[PDB]
Paper text:
To address this issue, we have used cryo-electron microscopy (cryo-EM) to determine the molecular structure of an amyloid fibril that is formed from peptide PNF-18. This 7-mer peptide (sequence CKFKFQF) was artificially designed as retroviral transduction enhancer and increases HIV-1 infection rates of TZM-bl cells by a factor of more than a hundred-fold.
We achieved a spatial resolution of 2.86 Å, based on the 0.143 Fourier shell correlation (FSC) criterion. Morphology II consists of three PFs, two peripheral ones and a central one, and six peptides in each molecular layer. The peptide conformation is kinked and shows two chemically different sides: a hydrophobic side that is formed by residues Phe3, Phe5, and Phe7 and a polar one that is formed by the side chains of Cys1, Lys2, Lys4, Gln6 as well as the N- and C-terminal groups of the polypeptide backbone. The hydrophobic contact mode occurs between the two type α peptide stacks and between a type β and a type γ stack. Only the peptides in stack γ, which are bound through the hydrophobic contact mode to stack β, adopt an angle of almost 45° relative to the fibril z-axis.
Numbering used by the authors:
A (entry chain L), B (entry chain F), C (entry chain R), D (entry chain X), E (entry chain E), F (entry chain K), ...: 1 to 7
Write the structure that this text describes.
Amino acid sequence: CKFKFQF
Amino acid sequence: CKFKFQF
Amino acid sequence: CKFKFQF
Amino acid sequence: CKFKFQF
Amino acid sequence: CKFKFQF
Amino acid sequence: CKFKFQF
Amino acid sequence: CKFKFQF
Amino acid sequence: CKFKFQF
Amino acid sequence: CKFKFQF
Amino acid sequence: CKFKFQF
Amino acid sequence: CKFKFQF
Amino acid sequence: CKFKFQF
Amino acid sequence: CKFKFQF
Amino acid sequence: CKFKFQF
Amino acid sequence: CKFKFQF
Amino acid sequence: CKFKFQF
Amino acid sequence: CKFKFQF
Amino acid sequence: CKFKFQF
Amino acid sequence: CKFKFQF
Amino acid sequence: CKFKFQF
Amino acid sequence: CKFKFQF
Amino acid sequence: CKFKFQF
Amino acid sequence: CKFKFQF
Amino acid sequence: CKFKFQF
């Protein structure tokens, strides 16, 4: 919801 | 919802 | 929910 | 929920 | 540097 | 450096 | 360095 | 270095 | 905090 | 905190 | 903390 | 803590 | 020099 | 030098 | 030098 | 040198 | 602090 | 601190 | 601390 | 500490 | 001539 | 001539 | 001539 | 000439 960081 | 950062 | 970091 | 780091 | 985000 | 996030 | 996250 | 996370 | 410097 | 420096 | 330096 | 240095 | 900070 | 910090 | 910190 | 820290 | 001289 | 001289 | 001289 | 000289 | 500091 | 510091 | 520090 | 420190 707040922060979604995908690599 | 707030921040979505995708790499 | 807060932070999701996937490598 | 908070931090999910997968390698 | 490329991205500099300060919250 | 490429990404610099400061919370 | 590539990612620098400071919480 | 590649990832530097400081909590 | 008192100081947040993103160089 | 008192100081947060992201160099 | 008093100091958080991410070099 | 008093010092957290991530070099 | 590049930076002179007298705190 | 690059940095001179007198705390 | 690169860094001179007088704490 | 690269670092001179006088604590 | 009492005296702060920056040259 | 009492005297802080930065040259 | 009493005297802090940085040259 | 009483005197801190950094050259 | 330039600076005279006496304690 | 330049700086005279006496304690 | 330059710096004279006497204790 | 440069620095004279006497204790």
